Amino acid sequence: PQITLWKRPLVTIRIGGQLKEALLDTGADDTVLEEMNLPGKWKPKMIGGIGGFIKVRQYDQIPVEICGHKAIGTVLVGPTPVNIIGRNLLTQIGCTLNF
Amino acid sequence: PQITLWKRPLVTIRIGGQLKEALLDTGADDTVLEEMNLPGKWKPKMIGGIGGFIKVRQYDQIPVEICGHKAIGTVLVGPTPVNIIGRNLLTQIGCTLNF
């Protein structure tokens, strides 16, 4: 797809058995999902941006489908206000910024 | 250009006559720069990101050259972690996401 930026670039993703809406975010190094009771082993992490840092749970080798395109990698879970797909998974689906 | 995402998508901008490095950020509604001087009128504003809300100064109708392409729009100044080019100016230069 080609996605314009008039509005927030929200797409459907599949992760952990759930369909969700998530933000395609070239500013994010990694992927962070709204709080959910995902199974598996995890390790604690802090991530930071506008407003400071939040504590999240880091899960590894998690399958994610983004708009029909498959990926697998690290997913963070915690008190983000929006589900965010970052560069770690955007590169796996071939996404580029074009102008 | 077609910018892939293995590294942060940083580019050179010119604003107020000065050259700076900035991040092309599709997850940001607004353009937010580190502390600097800009000419003309401003008013206080609040924005929220991954960690919560911050106070910024809002400058309207500011020319910005981004990787060679002209934009003129709103620039926020305040305690951002990095210089951020958000959707308000990415749309002006014709940026889309592609995969």
Ligand SMILES: Cc1ccccc1CNC(=O)[C@H]1N(C(=O)[C@@H](O)[C@H](Cc2ccccc2)NC(=O)c2cccc(O)c2C)CSC1(C)C
């Ligand atoms: C988000 C994430 C995921 C994994 C690991 C670290 C991080 C933290 N990174 C970051 O926060 C990076 N940024 C990003 O990733 C931004 O795209 C951020 C994403 C977001 C969207 C809605 C709610 C909350 C956050 N958006 C904003 O901060 C944002 C949101 C709305 C208006 C506004 O003026 C701004 C600047 C902006 S600052 C940053 C370049 C460091």
Ligand SMILES: [Cl-]
């Ligand atoms: Cl849940």
Ligand SMILES: [Cl-]
């Ligand atoms: Cl297939």
Ligand SMILES: [Cl-]
């Ligand atoms: Cl990963």
Ligand SMILES: [Cl-]
């Ligand atoms: Cl700089």
Ligand SMILES: [Cl-]
């Ligand atoms: Cl604007």
